[PDB]
Write a protein that binds this ligand. Structure first.
Ligand SMILES: *[C@@H]1O[C@H](CO)[C@@H](O[C@@H]2O[C@H](CO)[C@@H](O[C@@H]3O[C@H](CO)[C@@H](O)[C@H](O[C@H]4O[C@H](CO)[C@@H](O)[C@H](O)[C@@H]4O[C@H]4O[C@H](CO)[C@@H](O)[C@H](O)[C@@H]4O)[C@@H]3O)[C@H](O)[C@H]2NC(C)=O)[C@H](O)[C@H]1NC(C)=O
Ligand SMILES: *[C@@H]1O[C@H](CO)[C@@H](O[C@@H]2O[C@H](CO)[C@@H](O)[C@H](O)[C@H]2NC(C)=O)[C@H](O)[C@H]1NC(C)=O
Ligand SMILES: *[C@@H]1O[C@H](CO)[C@@H](O[C@@H]2O[C@H](CO)[C@@H](O)[C@H](O)[C@H]2NC(C)=O)[C@H](O)[C@H]1NC(C)=O
Ligand SMILES: *[C@@H]1O[C@H](CO)[C@@H](O[C@@H]2O[C@H](CO)[C@@H](O)[C@H](O)[C@H]2NC(C)=O)[C@H](O)[C@H]1NC(C)=O
Ligand SMILES: *[C@@H]1O[C@H](CO)[C@@H](O[C@@H]2O[C@H](CO)[C@@H](O)[C@H](O)[C@H]2NC(C)=O)[C@H](O)[C@H]1NC(C)=O
Ligand SMILES: *[C@@H]1O[C@H](CO)[C@@H](O[C@@H]2O[C@H](CO)[C@@H](O)[C@H](O)[C@H]2NC(C)=O)[C@H](O)[C@H]1NC(C)=O
Ligand SMILES: *[C@@H]1O[C@H](CO)[C@@H](O[C@@H]2O[C@H](CO)[C@@H](O)[C@H](O)[C@H]2NC(C)=O)[C@H](O)[C@H]1NC(C)=O
Ligand SMILES: *[C@@H]1O[C@H](CO)[C@@H](O[C@@H]2O[C@H](CO)[C@@H](O)[C@H](O)[C@H]2NC(C)=O)[C@H](O)[C@H]1NC(C)=O
Ligand SMILES: *[C@@H]1O[C@H](CO)[C@@H](O[C@@H]2O[C@H](CO)[C@@H](O)[C@H](O)[C@H]2NC(C)=O)[C@H](O)[C@H]1NC(C)=O
Ligand SMILES: *[C@@H]1O[C@H](CO)[C@@H](O[C@@H]2O[C@H](CO)[C@@H](O)[C@H](O)[C@H]2NC(C)=O)[C@H](O)[C@H]1NC(C)=O
Ligand SMILES: *[C@@H]1O[C@H](CO)[C@@H](O[C@@H]2O[C@H](CO)[C@@H](O)[C@H](O)[C@H]2NC(C)=O)[C@H](O)[C@H]1NC(C)=O
Ligand SMILES: *[C@@H]1O[C@H](CO)[C@@H](O[C@@H]2O[C@H](CO)[C@@H](O)[C@H](O)[C@H]2NC(C)=O)[C@H](O)[C@H]1NC(C)=O
Ligand SMILES: *[C@@H]1O[C@H](CO)[C@@H](O[C@@H]2O[C@H](CO)[C@@H](O)[C@H](O)[C@H]2NC(C)=O)[C@H](O)[C@H]1NC(C)=O
Ligand code: NAG
Ligand code: NAG
Ligand code: NAG
Ligand code: NAG
Ligand code: NAG
Ligand code: NAG
Ligand code: NAG
Lengths: 441, 125, 125, 125, 48, 48
C-alpha cells in the first residue's frame, strides 16, 4: 500500500559535533600577522530561524587550539634574537642611595662585572642597574636564572601590543554562534547563527583581572562549571568597564654593550631625577558600584541572607599571588589588596592606589627553563585600561559557616581565552541523506 | 537579516528544505599557519571526493534528487509521508534513522550492478 | 612545427576552435622546491575540482558541448551567429562578455533544479 | 578465511571476476612521519582524478561496465569470446594486450566527440 | 638457509633457526651515577 | 687534558687495566669559575 522506495538527497542541512583546525583572518609584532590571511571588509552572518543548539563553554577545543597557537607564536618570535649566555658571571653589587623614598630602599642594585668583547682575547669592565627580584646573593650576586637555564633576550624592534585576530574554519565545516543574551555558557541556546569567522579577539595576557575584554550586553554575568564545588574557578563579566591608570614615572636610560660580533646587550645606564615606585589608580565609587552589582548577582546562587566577603589571595608564586600584566614592554606585578577587601551583609574623587613592582626576567607561561629578558624602556611610561571581568575562587565553603569568602584567582591562561569563545562552537556538515519517496527508477 | 541562505533552512521542514539543496552543495568545496591550512584543505578535498564516489557508486551521479529501485522496509521506520515531509525536520529524521545507515547503502550498491548487467544484456541483442 | 596542439586553435574561429576541446581538456590535470611543487599541485587539484563541480551543478556533467534550457537575452549581446561562429575568436568573445558571466550561471543553476523536480513528479505517477 | 573480498577474484576467470568490480572500486580512495604520510596521500587523489577524467572523456562517466562504439580490430587479438571470458584471467589478458593500450584510448576519445556533435545537430532541429 | 648467490663467497648467508636458544647476559658491577653541572641547565653524568 | 691512573681496588686478573680513574678540570654554571672533578672511564674510551 505504502509502496515507498529509498531516495538519496545531497545537500541536506544536518551537522554534527567535530574538531578541526582553524586558520587566520586579520585586518613587527609578536603575534605575526604576516602569515595570517586578510579579513573580508564585510563579514557575513546567517541567523538560523527556529534552531536551538546545545552549548558548553567548558568542553571547547577552540580554547586548547588558541593556547597552543599562542605558545607556538611566542616560541617562534624569540628564535632570531640574542642569547644572553655570557651574562652568567660573578656580579659585585651595592645599594643605590641616590634620591630614593622610604618604600624603594633596596629595590635597585648597582652592579659591576667583567664581560667579553668583539675580540676573543679582550675583556671590558661594565656596570648596570638591576632589580632586587632579579639578583640573588651567592657582596656577590648572580642572576636568578643562571642555575636553571641560559635564556635569551627579547629583540627590541618587536612590539608586545595585542592585535585582534579572527579564527575561520575550513570548507565543509561551520561555526555556530549563540546570540541569546543572558546565556551562561552551558545549556540550550535558542537563538543561533552561522558565521564564517569569529570576531576580533585580543590575546591579552593578564592574571587576576580581565583587561581590554568584552562587556555583557545586559548585566553582570557569573559563570562556573560547578558552582557548588570550590575547586572550580568563577568567571565574572561586567556590563560596564572600570578605568585603571598604571604608570612607571622613573626616567630610565638605555645603553648598549657589545658582547661579541654583532651582539649587543641593552642595559639600564642610569635614572635621571627622582626614583619613585610605579603604581596604578582605580576609581573608588565605580569600584564600589561594580562590587555592589557583583554581590547582588552572587546572592542569587549563594543564598539571599548570606554574608559575602572579599579578601586577599591565599599565596603561591608572584604571578598567581599578584595581578601580573605588561605595558609598553615593562612587566608589572601589582598587589590588588585594597580592592578585594570588604564584607557585605544582606539588608567623591579619592582613588584606590596600588603601588607595585616591575620585573625583567619573565617566565610568561607555566614552563621551566626558558626566560624572556625584557630590555629596558627609555623614559617614563603610562597607560590606561578597562577592567571588564574578574576570576574569583571560593575558599572553604563547608556547611559549618554561613559566610562565603571569595578571593582573587588566576594563573592558567586558558581562562582568559574561555571568556571570549564561550558563545562559539564548531560543527561539520553531513550533506548525504536517505528518505522514503514514491517514485521508482 | 540573512535568514535565508546556506544553512538557513535547517529549522524548516524537509519538504521546504528540499528546495535549497544547491546552497549547501556549493560551499562544500570552498609559515606555520599555512601548514594547518594545507592540511585542512587536503582533508576537505578527501571528504568531497569520498562523498562524490559514494554518490556515483549508487548510480545517482550528477543529481541532487535521485530516487532508486530499492524498496523501503517498514521495519526501519513506520511513520508515513504525511507526518514526515511537512511535519518533521531533517535533523530529527537523521537522528531517528542514524542507526539504520549502512544497510541501505549496501542495498543500493548491489542493486546498481544488476541494472548495469541487464542494460548490457539488452544492448547485446 | 607543432602548430596544432593544446592551444594551437587559439587564433582560429570559434567554429573551428570548438572541434578540439579535448586537447585542452586533457592537460588541465597534468627539499625547498618540493614544497612549492606540492603547493602548486594542491592549487591545481582545487581548481580542477571547482571547475568540475560548477559543470556538474548545471546538469552538463560528463559533457564537453552541452546545451541548456536558459534562453539567451538579447541585451547581453546583439550580434547574430553569422558574425560569431566564423567571424570571431574565443578570446575576443570572452573579452567582450566577461562582464555578464555570473547571471547566466545563476540562471542555469536555478533552471536545473526545476527540471529535476519535474522529472521526479513525472516518475511518481 | 576471507577468500572472497577486494582482490579475492584475481585468480578467477574474467566472467566471474566481472561480477565484483565494486569491491575493487571502493578502496581506490581509502612529525617526520606526518610529512611522508601527507606526501603519500597527495598522490592517491591525483591518480584517482586521472582515472576518473580518463573514464569521463570517453563518455562512460559514472559506469562500471560501459560498452562503446569503436569496433574491435582482429589484429590486436585473434582469440574469440569462447576462450576469453571463461578460460582466461584478467592478469593474463592485460599481460597479453599491454602493448596495444593507447590506440583504443585515442579511438574512444575521437569517437565520443562525433556522437556529441551529432546529438547537438539532431537537437538543433 | 638463504643467500643471493650461494656459489659466490662474497654474498652473506642468512640462517633461520627452527627453535630459539636462550642466552643470558649480565654486567654484575654495581655502578653509581653522579651529576656534574657543566653550565646553566647542563649536567654531565659520570660513574662515581 | 685528563690525568688518569690505574684502579687497583678489588679487581681480578682479567680486569686489570680495564678501568681508569681520571681527574680533570671543568666549567660550571658561572663562566668565571672552574671545578676539579673525577670519574671512571673505560680503557677503550681513553687514548694516551
Ligand atoms: C588596553 O588597550 C589600551 C589602548 O588600546 C592600551 O594602551 C595603549 O598601549 C600602547 C602600547 O603601550 C600605547 O602606544 C604607545 O604609546 C607611546 C606613547 O605615545 C608610544 O611612545 C609607543 O610607541 C613606541 O612603541 C612602539 C611599539 O609599541 C614603537 O613602534 C614606537 O616606535 C615607539 O618606540 C619608540 O620609543 C620607545 C620609548 O622611547 C623606544 O624604546 C623605542 O626604541 C622607539 O624609539 C606606543 O605607540 C597607547 O598609547 C596606549 N593607549 C592609551 C590610550 O594610553 C593598553 O596597553 C591595553 N592593555 C593591555 C594590558 O595591553
Ligand atoms: C653605579 O656605579 C657606577 C660605578 O661606581 C657609577 O658610575 C660612577 O659615577 C661617578 C659619579 O657618580 C663617576 O665619578 C665615576 O667615574 C663613575 N664610574 C664609572 C666606571 O664610570 C654610577 O654613577 C652608579 N649609579 C648610581 C645610580 O648610583
Ligand atoms: C674583573 O676581572 C679582574 C681580573 O681579571 C678582577 O680583579 C681581580 O679580582 C680578584 C678577586 O677575586 C683578585 O684576586 C685579583 O688580584 C684581581 N686582579 C686584578 C688585575 O685586579 C675584577 O674583580 C673583576 N671585576 C669584578 C667586578 O669582579
Ligand atoms: C559539583 O561538585 C559537587 C561536590 O563534589 C558534586 O557532588 C559530590 O559528588 C561526589 C561524587 O561521588 C560525592 O561523593 C559527593 O558526596 C558530592 N557532594 C555533594 C555536596 O553533593 C556534584 O556532583 C558536582 N556536580 C556535578 C554536576 O557533577
Ligand atoms: C594616581 O593617584 C595619585 C594620587 O592618589 C597621583 O599622585 C599625584 O600625581 C599628580 C600628577 O599630576 C601630582 O601633581 C600630585 O602631586 C600627586 N599627588 C600625590 C599625593 O601623589 C598620581 O599621579 C596618579 N597616577 C596616575 C597614573 O593616575
Ligand atoms: C585615568 O586617566 C584618564 C585620562 O588621563 C582620566 O580622565 C580624565 O580625568 C580628568 C579629571 O576628572 C579630566 O579633567 C579629564 O578630562 C579626563 N580625560 C579623559 C580623556 O577622560 C581619568 O580620570 C583617570 N582615572 C583615574 C581613576 O585617575
Ligand atoms: C593580604 O592581607 C594580609 C593581611 O595584612 C597580608 O598578610 C601579611 O603578609 C605580610 C607578608 O608580606 C606580613 O608581614 C603581615 O604580617 C601579614 N599580615 C598580618 C595581619 O599578619 C597578605 O600578605 C596580603 N596579601 C598579599 C598578596 O600580600
Ligand atoms: C599588599 O598590600 C598590603 C596592604 O598594604 C600589605 O599588607 C601590609 O604588609 C606589611 C608588610 O610589608 C605590614 O607591615 C602591614 O601591616 C600590612 N597591612 C595590612 C593592612 O595588613 C601586603 O604586605 C602587600 N603584599 C605584599 C606581598 O607585600
Ligand atoms: C573602554 O571602554 C569604553 C566604553 O566601552 C570604550 O569606549 C568605547 O569605544 C568604542 C570603540 O569600539 C566606541 O564605539 C564607543 O562609543 C566608546 N564608548 C564610550 C562611552 O566612549 C573604550 O574604547 C575602552 N577602552 C579600551 C582601551 O578598549
Ligand atoms: C654466482 O657467482 C658466480 C661466481 O662469480 C657466477 O659465475 C661467474 O660469473 C662470472 C660472470 O662474468 C664469470 O666471469 C665467472 O667465470 C663465473 N664463475 C663461475 C665459477 O661460474 C654466477 O654467474 C653467479 N650467479 C648468477 C645467477 O649470476
Ligand atoms: C654464567 O655461568 C657461570 C658459571 O659458568 C655462573 O657463575 C656462577 O654464578 C652463580 C650466581 O648465582 C654463583 O653463585 C656461582 O658461584 C658462580 N660460579 C662460577 C664458577 O662462576 C654465572 O652466574 C652465570 N651467569 C648467568 C647470567 O647465568
Ligand atoms: C678515584 O680517585 C679519586 C681521587 O684520587 C678517589 O677519591 C678519593 O678517595 C680517597 C679515599 O677513598 C679520599 O681520601 C679522597 O678525599 C678522595 N678524593 C676526592 C677528590 O674526593 C676515588 O676513591 C678513586 N676511585 C677509585 C675507584 O679508585
Ligand atoms: C686544573 O687546573 C690547575 C690550574 O691550572 C692545574 O694546576 C696547574 O698545573 C700546571 C701544569 O701542571 C702548573 O704549571 C700550575 O702551576 C698548576 N697550578 C696550580 C694552582 O696547581 C691542574 O693540574 C688542573 N687539573 C688537571 C687534572 O690537570
Ligand atoms: C641594602 O638595603 C637593604 C634594605 O635596607 C638591606 O637589607 C641591605 O643589607 C643593604 N645592603 C647593603 C648596604 O649592602
Ligand atoms: C636555583 O637556586 C634557587 C635558589 O638558590 C633554588 O630555589 C632552585 O631550586 C635552584 N634551581 C635548581 C634547578 O635546583
Ligand atoms: C546556567 O547554567 C546551568 C548549569 O547547569 C544550566 O543548568 C542553566 O540552564 C543555565 N541557565 C540558562 C538560563 O540556560
Ligand atoms: C627624561 O630625561 C630626558 C633626558 O634628560 C629628558 O629629555 C626627558 O624630558 C625626561 N622625561 C621626563 C618625563 O621628564
Ligand atoms: C581593608 O579594609 C579594612 C576595613 O575593615 C581597612 O581597615 C584596612 O585598612 C583595609 N586594608 C587595606 C590594605 O586597604
Ligand atoms: C648496589 O649498591 C647499593 C648501595 O649500597 C645497594 O643498595 C644495592 O643493593 C647494591 N646492589 C646489589 C645487587 O647488591
Ligand atoms: C695499568 O695497567 C696496565 C696493565 O697492567 C699497564 O699496561 C699500564 O702500564 C698500567 N698503567 C699505570 C700503572 O699507570
Amino acid at each position: 500500500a505504502e509502496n515507498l522506495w529509498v531516495t538519496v538527497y545531497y545537500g541536506v542541512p544536518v551537522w554534527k559535533d567535530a574538531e578541526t583546525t582553524l586558520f587566520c583572518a586579520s585586518d613587527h609584532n609578536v603575534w605575526a600577522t604576516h602569515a595570517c590571511v586578510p579579513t573580508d571588509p564585510n563579514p557575513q552572518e546567517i541567523h538560523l530561524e527556529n534552531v536551538t543548539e546545545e552549548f558548553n563553554m567548558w568542553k571547547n577545543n577552540m580554547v586548547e587550539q588558541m593556547h597552543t597557537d599562542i605558545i607556538s607564536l611566542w616560541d617562534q618570535s624569540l628564535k632570531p634574537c640574542v642569547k644572553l649566555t655570557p651574562l652568567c658571571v660573578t656580579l659585585q653589587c651595592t645599594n643605590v642611595t641616590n634620591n630614593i623614598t622610604d618604600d624603594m630602599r633596596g629595590e635597585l642594585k648597582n652592579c659591576s662585572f667583567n664581560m667579553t668583547t668583539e675580540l676573543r682575547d679582550k675583556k671590558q669592565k661594565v656596570y648596570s642597574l638591576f632589580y632586587r627580584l632579579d639578583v640573588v646573593q651567592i657582596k656577590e650576586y648572580r642572576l636568578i636564572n643562571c642555575n636553571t637555564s641560559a635564556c635569551t633576550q627579547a629583540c627590541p624592534k618587536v612590539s608586545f601590543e595585542p592585535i585582534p585576530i579572527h579564527y575561520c574554519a575550513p570548507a565543509g565545516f561551520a561555526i555556530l554562534k549563540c546570540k541569546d543574551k543572558k546565556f551562561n555558557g552551558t545549556g540550550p541556546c535558542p537563538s543561533v547563527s552561522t558565521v564564517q569567522c569569529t570576531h576580533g579577539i585580543k590575546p591579552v595576557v593578564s592574571t587576576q583581572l580581565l583587561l581590554n575584554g568584552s562587556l555583557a550586553e545586559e548585566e553582570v554575568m557569573i559563570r562556573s562549571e560547578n558552582i557548588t564545588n570550590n575547586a572550580k574557578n568563577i568567571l565574572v563579566q561586567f556590563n560596564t568597564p572600570v578605568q585603571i591608570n598604571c604608570t612607571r614615572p622613573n626616567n630610565n636610560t638605555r645603553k648598549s654593550i657589545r658582547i661579541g660580533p654583532g651582539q649587543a646587550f641593552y642595559a639600564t645606564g642610569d635614572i635621571i631625577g627622582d626614583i619613585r615606585q610605579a603604581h596604578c589608580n582605580v576609581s573608588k565609587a565605580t569600584w564600589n558600584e561594580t562590587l555592589g552589582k557583583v554581590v547582588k548577582q552572587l546572592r542569587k546562587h549563594f543564598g539571599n541572607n548570606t554574608i559575602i566577603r572579599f579578601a586577599n589571595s591565599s599565596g603561591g608564586d608572584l604571578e598567581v599571588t599578584t595581578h601580573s600584566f605588561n605595558c609598553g614592554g615593562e612587566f608589572f606585578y601589582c598587589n590588588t589588596s585594597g580592592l578585594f577587601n570588604s564584607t557585605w551583609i544582606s539588608n567623591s574623587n579619592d582613588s584606590i592606589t596600588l603601588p607595585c613592582r616591575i620585573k625583567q626576567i619573565i617566565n610568561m607561561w607555566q614552563r621551566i627553563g626558558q626566560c624572556m629578558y625584557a630590555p629596558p624602556i627609555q623614559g617614563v611610561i603610562r597607560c590606561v585600561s578597562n577592567i571588564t571581568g574578574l576570576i574569583l575562587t571560593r575558599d572553604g565553603g563547608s556547611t559549618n559557616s554561613t559566610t562565603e569568602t571569595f578571593r582573587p584567582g588566576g594563573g592558567d591562561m586558558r581562562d582568559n581565552w574561555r571568556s571570549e569563545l564561550y558563545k562559539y562552537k564548531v560543527v561539520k556538515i553531513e550533506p548525504l541523506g536517505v528518505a522514503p519517496t514514491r517514485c521508482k527508477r | 537579516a540573512v535568514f535565508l541562505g546556506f544553512l538557513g533552512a535547517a529549522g524548516s521542514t524537509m519538504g521546504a528544505a528540499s528546495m535549497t539543496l544547491t546552497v549547501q552543495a556549493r560551499n562544500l568545496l570552498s609559515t606555520v599557519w599555512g601548514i594547518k591550512q594545507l592540511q585542512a584543505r587536503v582533508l576537505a578535498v578527501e571528504r568531497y571526493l569520498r562523498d562524490q564516489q559514494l554518490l556515483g557508486i549508487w548510480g545517482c551521479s550528477g543529481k541532487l534528487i535521485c530516487c532508486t529501485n530499492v524498496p523501503w522496509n517498514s521495519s526501519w521506520s513506520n511513520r508515513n509521508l504525511s507526518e514526515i515531509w511537512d511535519n518533521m525536520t531533517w535533523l530529527q529524521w537523521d537522528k531517528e534513522i542514524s542507526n539504520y545507515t549502512q544497510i541501505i547503502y549496501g542495498l543500493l550498491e548491489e542493486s546498481q550492478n544488476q541494472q548495469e548487467k541487464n542494460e548490457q544484456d539488452l544492448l547485446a541483442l
